[PDB]
Symmetry: C3
Subunit: 258 residues, 3 copies
């Protein structure tokens, strides 16, 4: 056939449709579609000199046995790369991947000419009120947004809930002793577990002026279930830091970077 | 009926088309919500020919007013998965297509993302305007969320969102304890008292050292963010001069 | 007036097939770049005429005697072409330039969270004074494609034009003298500080183990080498140079 196929509908309820139907069995004994069965396709082909070659296609394919549930995907294929985009039965879209774990998945880079808005995971601790253990203050409160960090369940740190990269800064005020003081960020009180890693930034300063801040910083990947703490290295140095409710006396801030 | 449908075109200028046409009446112009056509997939489940994906073209306006349509991509299971509106705007998991791409869910990218990020700065505290409000010699910004140039005394938040802010200023030569604070148009409490934000500040005295103040949390459109000394009598003990190393305010949109 | 294609069987399926050649049936010729292989077109009556109401096209991106390469195009009534999928699999929304795997000409709104690789790098351990505003650093580390902190001991090299947020710190020694460091472009502080489109600052400190800090925020160019250190050699005697990162670090994050 060389003629364009025209489907024309006049009316208020009806529409024009190309309908592609798939069953197993026969018209006399139809059987349910099975996982992996192609329901149908719109196929493009082009002459290359010697053969008709696949030149793009849009496919509907079953992803569950239909006697169990009607679940399908849509596939968009181009000449060259082959399958370029998938829409799974969940509605989840993959570009360059067929594993559609999130609502949109891109196997590659993304370039946007304007701006991107999204929920970003971050959390804070505020108000160092007592020394719990080395490198672990008790904090009066915490707060967080998103799903990667929990800063409210534990009074002594922020819990990492997802593997990821995190940027962390902890500050606390020196008291009035005039002695040198510092705080450090730690993994459940273990400073070395962070500081000794060759894939992170870990630092801290000293201070002595009353009301000035000693600071500690971390940048790098953390593991789910990690409790991030911050505090004085030892009890006698905690005696020389300010412990009180207002956040200006001390805070920890954690941002998910990636 | 059981046979594949083929459309074959040869030659230099023409192409193969499946064309689906819709009118109302028997002829009446297409109305909003009318389907122009669809490619429909159906599969036997043992009881019926069940919807197994479809690609639809649907009118978004009455055609006597304007020819506006959307394209819809449906799957068996979730139903409509992706929409392209007459604006070209794409929705995945939503039919509300406000921006060029809208995703109702999370996005996972294996590589890196480039985009315009909103941020703004104030540089060079040149005088005390009010409690927690310096006059700044200049400002600069990128993007659409923050305006650091219209006013010399603060950065205006143009869009509701989450912001990370740090303000620093140098102590002078008095040896007195000095500090600065970030504020909402001079009102420090309006930020500090919130249980959904970080707000802090340090003291310093050594000449050329920084007092710093930090904020993290949501701000509202039209908010004017300021930073400065808590009281006029302290201004004499801070450094006010043009170079940015004397003091700056940095605002980054986080989300 | 519907068109139905029904298939019963274990392996057979229903297809609409659109084929394109040049030439004639007895003397065909290969598809050329820009030829349409086929299309699904929608049209709607507006009262006067049949108006374009969306289309899905397959179009050649190479001469087929060289290679079979096509794109898919999705057009809507109103804006016209809205999405393109190139032969590489790269997708454009609002643009036909498909440089990356996804390209959006506009804004993007996500209700949830986005995960992606972010470029960042660090230098750790100021071990010597090399030149004004240039420390030698014991080690570097980076993630991503925009920043290289391991090739040069004296800085982080920007590999791609972009916006960067940079903080450098170093500990004062035991003298009680005023010390500072600054971020620089290959030791040239003024090259950054004098720019009206950037933040550049630094502090002084004197207390032993306290930090002097310098900060930068703004755009940088490919091949820029970012350094940080004391302003002059005589001040090195009053800063701490040693391997542990708590003595000093530089952190660079790509912002955009």
């Amino acid at each position: 056939n060389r003629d364009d196929l025209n489907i024309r509908t006049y009316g208020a309820t009806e529409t024009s449709s190309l309908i592609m139907l798939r069953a197993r069995g026969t018209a006399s004994a139809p059987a349910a579609v099975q996982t992996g069965d192609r329901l149908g396709g719109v196929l493009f082909r082009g002459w290359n000199g010697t053969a008709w070659m696949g030149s793009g296609q849009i496919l509907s394919v079953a992803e569950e046995n239909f006697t169990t549930a009607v679940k399908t995907n849509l596939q968009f294929h181009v000449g060259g790369a082959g399958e370029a985009m998938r829409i799974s039965n969940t509605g989840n879209v993959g570009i360059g991947t067929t594993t559609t774990t999130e609502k949109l998945n891109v196997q590659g880079n993304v370039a946007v000419s304007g701006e991107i808005t999204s929920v970003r995971s971050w959390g804070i601790k505020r108000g160092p009120t007592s020394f719990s253990a080395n490198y672990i203050n008790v904090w009066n409160s915490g707060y967080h947004v998103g799903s990667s960090i929990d800063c409210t369940t534990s009074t002594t740190g922020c819990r990492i809930l997802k593997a990821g990269t995190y940027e962390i800064r902890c500050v606390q005020r020196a008291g009035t002793s005039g002695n040198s003081v510092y705080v450090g960020i730690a993994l459940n009180g273990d400073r070395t577990a962070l500081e000794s890693r060759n894939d992170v930034l870990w630092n801290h300063s000293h201070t002595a002026y009353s009301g000035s801040y000693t600071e500690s910083n971390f940048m790098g990947t953390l593991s789910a279930n990690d409790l991030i703490t911050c505090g004085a290295p030892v009890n006698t140095m905690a005696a020389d830091l300010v412990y009180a409710v207002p956040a200006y006396n001390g805070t920890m801030q954690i941002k998910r970077v990636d």
